[PDB]
Design a protein around this ligand. Structure first.
Ligand SMILES: O=P(O)(O)OC[C@H]1O[C@](O)(CO)[C@@H](O)[C@@H]1O
Ligand SMILES: O=P(O)(O)OC[C@H]1O[C@](O)(CO)[C@@H](O)[C@@H]1O
Ligand SMILES: O=P(O)(O)OC[C@H]1O[C@](O)(CO)[C@@H](O)[C@@H]1O
Ligand SMILES: O=P(O)(O)OC[C@H]1O[C@](O)(CO)[C@@H](O)[C@@H]1O
Ligand SMILES: [Mg+2]
Ligand SMILES: [Mg+2]
Ligand SMILES: [Mg+2]
Ligand SMILES: [Mg+2]
Ligand SMILES: [Mg+2]
Ligand SMILES: [Mg+2]
Ligand SMILES: [Mg+2]
Ligand SMILES: [Mg+2]
Lengths: 331, 331, 331, 331
């Protein structure tokens, strides 16, 4: 127990290959500090009276909670002091944040400081989602720098504050899970090179929107309940926090869906800091992530708070759904 | 912050009324120690390699996990040393456990050492469920002592290992929530005299069993999706761990269902250590808990591992469902 | 690791012999909560800005620190809610505290909320010292109830906030050490039936008072440095916190001295909540504790803040010193 | 509380001036992980049965304890994976450790994995001491690289596992203290640019060696007890762990002494990983550190396990002692 393989040691060794400026490690180390702070607050929110609203609404119209503010501040602050970022996109901020010249690095980070707001009060799993982009342009940093398609992601992942706190990280060569050791405050590698099953037996969606589902989702769900080949029906699971449902999909396999509907042409989840990071993790894990008409990572954003339909998980499950959408594709 | 209202102080003061032998406090204090031990292990299970099966099956046919064993042992051991119990019923033990004479107390405790096994590996919320019965008979303690209807419960509750660890406790006069303070290892009162909303807007059930649902559940679910009065459709939520889904139902209101079906006349959840404790908490919170034909707490068990259909939550939501069952009631 | 032997389980089993009202266990459990709270604050005092004075002076003329207040409040509050005490004597309170009728128990507790004030800022070991007396009289509880000689102690001990937090407890039959497990917030038995060595090789005293030492101490110290039989000279150790120096004396053996001097006829340490508890622990461990003229536990106090000279530790070391005092005894 | 100033952020900003390869930060971050691991083990050593010997002796003849091994391994391992060191000198290792080519950095680190062994069992303050040297030569790394005088130190400091865990760090421009926040596992700046008082009122030495003291120490101590100007005599303090006694000297001022004696021409404490780091911290804090004949940092080592007499602390106190040595200086 004297050779603890931390996220820092892990990243440094992998990055030892290309050998860069080393700010990605600074980026992640900074992010890990924020995640530990969030994990500690969430673990005792009730006692610290951290539940409740903050008395404000975000650009996407959500009722800002106190933990939204706290988590957002923690992440903003640590990312700035990392000397690794220049542009920051947060769900909680109307416009992109531009890092002061002195603390500027070459990365653009889009993040959801706290995902799963409806589940804060009921102690259900919540988390933090992030996507790292390397700044390509040469002109002054700005919002445009965060408007890159998910294919350009260099690193993505999420922190899961569940029965245990986990930091799932995906990079060019794969996905790794690190668990937070409460005693020494370190994320330790517990899962190496994670790969999602080709086909699962769990479908995850909010069926409360059945009246708005398009004929494709409606048919897919009916198929998971009444299999045509008389195979065992899929089990259903919907925690309510994207980070939780996606993580389960990653380790148990299956499918998670937050499609578009009669009232939401572009679904609900945000593309920059929700859809893209998960699509990226999913694809680096051998999975798929589609809107139902196109790969999520190939969408070229025009609004940092843009919404996108997302269907992701095991390739065979996602493909079965795409085939149905194609079957219903109209003029 | 120098007057910490712990579960111990709370119980002692309430019990200061009747003023008994004081072993209920010993019971709960002992239970709190086990819950803290479970919380700590779960928080770092991956790092401690606590995931995986234990290589055994319980009386109910589940694949025993390593945490099942650990949690079960911790609870068995602390309950024995409390000098407050005589008969113990655990999901993990084939037969009732009889406490040696020297350490015997007047309570019978039925418990689910670790609830939500399918969600262990994906870090989804899990917990511990318990029900305390006072031994009434005078003859040697035995299994029969655990075969009392839920109406006889003196105390019930559950530990929720979610984004935060909470100990929900219900007694004759009401329900209170205590949150575990990781720093000093104490459960502190965060929610006093909890009452569930008369009507919610969330339904919780595994729709993957649609092909087996009886006409009553089928109709109820269709109604939550396509309201006849054109009101907003209910939102759906199903974490997969009874403790998590029930807790959310308790604080957000709504309905949780694990009904009987074409293949499971008595549903799945166990009556002694799953259904009864939750039915009790639910009723002390002003909620309802039915099988769809009778109150859960009024069932007289004949098998400590007996299963029971359970529908619980907001009184108006549960009642709307009972009315439907009554509408379908056949000869 | 599923059978954790806590201080609570330990006390309950030992007390299972006589079998009393059970409030001693309530007393100790309450005290353990306060000690964990103090341990957590001290562990992060600098970060919580808990260092510094509180802007007040106690009856003994010390400059009250912020941790003095905090620790004092925590202990006062938990002892009151334990329903086990009636009179309380604290170093920080001018007069004895009388527990309101409703929360009254049969015990009198004298305590030093935080011992070793000079070592707070330098992060040197500090602690908490307590002495429990059973109320014998029948009239209204009052200060007089705390004016009993140490021989009347029913329980005594101290919490040591050092490299690790330890709770040393002595009762009629012996001494046991319990270590605080930070992860689950429980004191676990690590040392059973502790006995001090008959003779040590360490002397502990503040030699900065050499100019005031009486001929007895002066001669004793010279003897520890220049042994007459040419044996190895004693090693010297003086941490500055009674709890630390006494604990070391208990586990390594030797002698600790805070004698009277030309300017302090009654030494410095307080008899009620400093000298007596340690003398008691020391004697139950097979050690001795004298003023240099009489056993510390046999002094009948007349002032709850009374001071007393104290020399304690290994019987042979203490006796060698008594012989010297007797050699110098004058008309 | 959303802008936590950690040791990492602190070092990075200061180093932002010169702007180097950035491995010093990697060095320190790696070291901080080891220190947190040691702090956690020490906090629960008794419970983890970490007390006792390891069944071996070091080059300096000490009886190796289990924590010596653990701490040594943790430090060796993290320093290697930091990609910042090439030569390592540990009290526990007979010869210098040469870092494999792949993980080599430009720093040489001399360290005492666990200081204060005699105080392990009695829960008295213990710590970790380190000294960082930049490799100057160009030939293959070797032991010679660790044989530099303390004046060549680039960074030095120590971890103090006391009532709180503190990381004291000194660099070219000054000394800063960082306290470990147990909740998030981070060292936070609590003391900025620490400066020692010009004169103190506490002397720290093991007077048990009085029979071996040279006439200089003997006279100095007598002077601290019987001041010639009738000023208040100095208070005495000797915890037994260099890290603890030195830290107190740093924050309270005064003097700490472990001089040479009739049997130990070169005192006891080791120059490479004990004397130099403390002399460096002391001097960067405006203090002094002498052998009694020459500055400690100016000694050119010839043996990595070389011993050295050390007298350090407030400049006026140390100078008063040097004057006495000069008064006794013989042919
Ligand atoms: O309540 P709904 O509409 O199912 O939305 C739940 C989804 O919204 C979010 O809370 C938005 O952050 C996701 O975490 C989650 O997947
Ligand atoms: O996978 P299913 O059939 O929905 O069962 C889930 C239910 O079973 C349990 O895991 C049994 O403990 C409950 O915690 C949960 O509510
Ligand atoms: O500084 P002095 O006079 O040696 O006093 C130290 C003694 O005083 C106290 O700080 C009083 O609480 C003891 O803990 C300690 O033994
Ligand atoms: O027992 P002695 O000879 O006073 O030695 C104590 C000194 O030795 C050490 O334990 C050696 O590490 C120091 O920490 C301490 O200052
Ligand atoms: Mg969010
Ligand atoms: Mg979100
Ligand atoms: Mg279970
Ligand atoms: Mg269960
Ligand atoms: Mg005190
Ligand atoms: Mg004291
Ligand atoms: Mg050492
Ligand atoms: Mg040392």
């Amino acid at each position: 127990d004297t050779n603890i393989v931390t996220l820092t040691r892990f990243v440094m060794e992998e990055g030892r290959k290309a050998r860069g400026t080393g700010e990605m490690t600074q980026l992640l180390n900074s992010l890990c500090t924020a995640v530990k702070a969030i994990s500690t607050a969430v673990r005792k929110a009730g006692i610290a009276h951290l539940y409740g609203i903050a008395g404000s609404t975000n650009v996407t119209g959500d009722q800002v909670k106190k933990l939204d503010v706290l988590s957002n501040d923690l992440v903003i602050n640590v990312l700035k002091s990392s000397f690794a970022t220049c542009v920051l996109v947060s769900e909680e901020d109307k416009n992109a944040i531009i890092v002061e010249p002195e603390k500027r690095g070459k990365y653009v980070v889009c993040f959801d400081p706290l995902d799963g707001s409806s589940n804060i009060d009921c102690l259900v799993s919540i988390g933090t989602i992030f996507g790292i982009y390397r700044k390509n342009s040469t002109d002054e940093p700005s919002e445009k720098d965060a408007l890159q398609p998910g294919r350009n992601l260099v690193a993505a992942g999420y922190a899961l504050y569940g029965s245990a706190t986990m930091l799932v990280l995906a990079m060019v060569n794969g996905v790794n899970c690190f668990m937070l050791d409460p005693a020494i405050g370190e994320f330790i590698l517990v899962d190496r090179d994670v790969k999602i099953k080709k086909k699962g037996s769990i479908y995850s969606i909010n069926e409360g929107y059945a009246k708005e589902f398009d004929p494709a989702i409606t048919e897919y769900i009916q198929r998971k309940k009444f299999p045509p080949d008389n195979s065992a029906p899929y089990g259903a699971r919907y925690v309510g926090s994207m980070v939780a449902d996606v993580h389960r999909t990653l380790v148990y396999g299956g499918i998670f869906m937050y499609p578009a509907n009669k009232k939401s042409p572009k679904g609900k989840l945000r593309l920059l800091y929700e859809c893209n990071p998960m699509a990226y993790v999913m694809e680096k894990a051998g999975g798929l992530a589609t809107t139902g008409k196109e790969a999520v990572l190939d969408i070229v954003p025009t609004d940092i708070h843009q919404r996108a339909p997302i269907i992701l998980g095991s390739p065979e499950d996602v493909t079965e759904l795409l085939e149905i959408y194609q079957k219903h594709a109209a003029k």
